[PDB]
Amino acid sequence: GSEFRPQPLPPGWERRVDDRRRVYYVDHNTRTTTWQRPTMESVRNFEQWQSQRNQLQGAMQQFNQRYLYSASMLAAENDPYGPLPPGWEKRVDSTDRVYFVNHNTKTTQWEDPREEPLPEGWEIRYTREGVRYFVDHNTRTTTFKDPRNGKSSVTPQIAYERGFRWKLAHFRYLCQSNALPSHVKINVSRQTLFEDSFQQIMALKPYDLRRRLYVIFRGELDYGGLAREWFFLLSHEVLNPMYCLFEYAGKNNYCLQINPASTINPDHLSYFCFIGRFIAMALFHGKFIDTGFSLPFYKRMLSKKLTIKDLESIDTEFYNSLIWIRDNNIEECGLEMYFSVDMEVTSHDLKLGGSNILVTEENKDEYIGLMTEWRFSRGVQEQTKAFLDGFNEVVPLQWLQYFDEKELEVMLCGMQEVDLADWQRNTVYRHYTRNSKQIIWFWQFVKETDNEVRMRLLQFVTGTCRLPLGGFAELMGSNGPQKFCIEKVGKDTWLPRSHTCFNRLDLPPYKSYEQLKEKLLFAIEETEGFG
């Protein structure tokens, strides 16, 4: 009774057997090739992709304006004594270091950081008056007690800021301290970049990817921009449907994820390794990519734990399914769930012997536990390991230790200047009008702040630092087009929530600009979790 009712092959497509009797398919049209039986559906994804990855001619021009980040040596002082207190600059003369305190116009020959380098993870800072304090990125705390001398100054202590500049300058250094000499030659044709890039990288030992990068495109320059270019194109190139590597959670190109069916491709692990070494290489040589993984993917890289609000980002209908079971009686409601999942079709047991354990109130929380874990890692575990190991042999993941996921995404992706007019014209208000005090204040906040907090605000709401390609008018959600939207919720004692799939900032009606600036800034900086 209907053993096979699939689609026929679209004309211009031949099924084949290879030298070992696997089955592959050949788009006679595009003169291309895939392991995965085509539907007339998936071709329009490929067409949705060929349109992306052909029209990206001018995506390049913006993506180089993107090379705003941190004027590397021009703005990265990881001096081991640490910084000069405010108003102090360092100087030299007869090859002898003098110190000027512009704060006072005196001049010492003694460095004011009085000799004993401080432990892994700690940063010295000073204050608008001058007092030295200490920032502990191993716990995101700030005591006044020096880690070495147990010492201090009377106390009235300080709130934690993240120090990205400093966490980055320590990364840059770690990368250049392990860089090898000579160069590694990457030779690719534009028509075959990928197949090409894959084979080369995957034939090198990992250390060689740490030599200088000499990329050249057969038939065409500056070595630097070609490296920018290579990473740009190749980042879009692994996204290509015919390879079966990644799918997407929501419609269009929303919420990129490892496809669990990539196993139809018998080399998929070697590609996740390849893709893995590729992202590491981009970081290690200070080049951006543009593939855009989801924030809970970066969290697995940091090996932080995947909470239930990360689940809201990647499958909004599955997360509502779990919240409902969590906040309502399920003996009251007539369904019959067990500790297993049907997903290709095979029943996998969240727990030992799950498939014959009824989900009762007694254990519905343990169910929601396992359910969340499974959702994040259904069928893509090797794929993930493959990628992480591929990454790890080129940049050891431990070098990422003091980064949160929303920093790890600015290090890969870029950091463009946000167009403030385009943002506010293409913003929609639920339970506000453009004359609402919280809304006027919100854009005063946005004009008044700086670009790094604008990026984090955007990461907090939409889930990504990448502004979409066609203005904020084309910003996308999990159900397709979904403009940035600010919505009045609760009273002034609440905290801002975010709904990443609908690009919705839930913004309580605060009684002042000062309270709003505060309550909000805290929310966009807050990262839960530890790795």
Author numbering: 3 to 116, 123 to 163, 167 to 231, 234 to 357, 362 to 548
Please quote the paper that reports this structure.
The HECT E3 ubiquitin ligases 1 (WWP1) and 2 (WWP2) are responsible for the ubiquitin-mediated degradation of key tumour suppressor proteins and are dysregulated in various cancers and diseases. Two members of the NEDD4 family, WW domain-containing E3 ligase 1 (WWP1) and 2 (WWP2), are of particular interest due to their targeting of the tumour suppressor protein phosphatase and tensin homolog (PTEN) as well as various other tumour suppressors and transcription factors. The HECT-E3 ligases may offer the best druggability as they participate directly in the Ub transfer, unlike the RING-type, and with their catalytic function relying on a single active-site cysteine. We evaluate their structure-activity relationship (SAR) by synthesis aided by molecular docking using X-ray crystal structures of WWP1 and WWP2 solved as part of this study and improved over those previously reported.
However, we were able to solve and refine structures for the apo-proteins which were improvements on previously published data. Interestingly, this is the most complete structure of WWP1 solved to date revealing a structured WW2 domain. The grid boxes to perform the docking simulations were generated in cavities on the HECT domain surrounding the active site cysteines 890 (WWP1) and 838 (WWP2) given the ability of NSC-217913 to interfere with ubiquitination. The ligand poses of compound 11 in both WWP1-2L34H and WWP2-LH are somewhat similar due to the similarities of the proposed binding site between these two enzymes. These poses show the imidazo[4,5-b]pyrazine moiety engaging in π-π interactions with the phenolic side chain of Tyr639WWP1-2L34H and Tyr587WWP2-LH alongside the Cys640WWP1-2L34H and Cys588WWP2-LH backbone amides participating in hydrogen bonding interactions with the imidazole nitrogen. When docked against WWP1-2L34H, the side chain of 11 orients itself so as to interact with the guanidium ion of Arg855, orientating compound 11 in closer contact with Tyr639, allowing π-π interactions with both rings of the imidazo[4,5-b]pyrazine core. As the heterocycle is oriented very similarly in the predicted complexes with both WWP1-2L34H and WWP2-LH, it may be that the increased π-π interactions and ion-dipole interactions between the ester and guanidinium functionalities of 11 docked to WWP1-2L34H provide the additional strength of binding observed in the IC50 values.
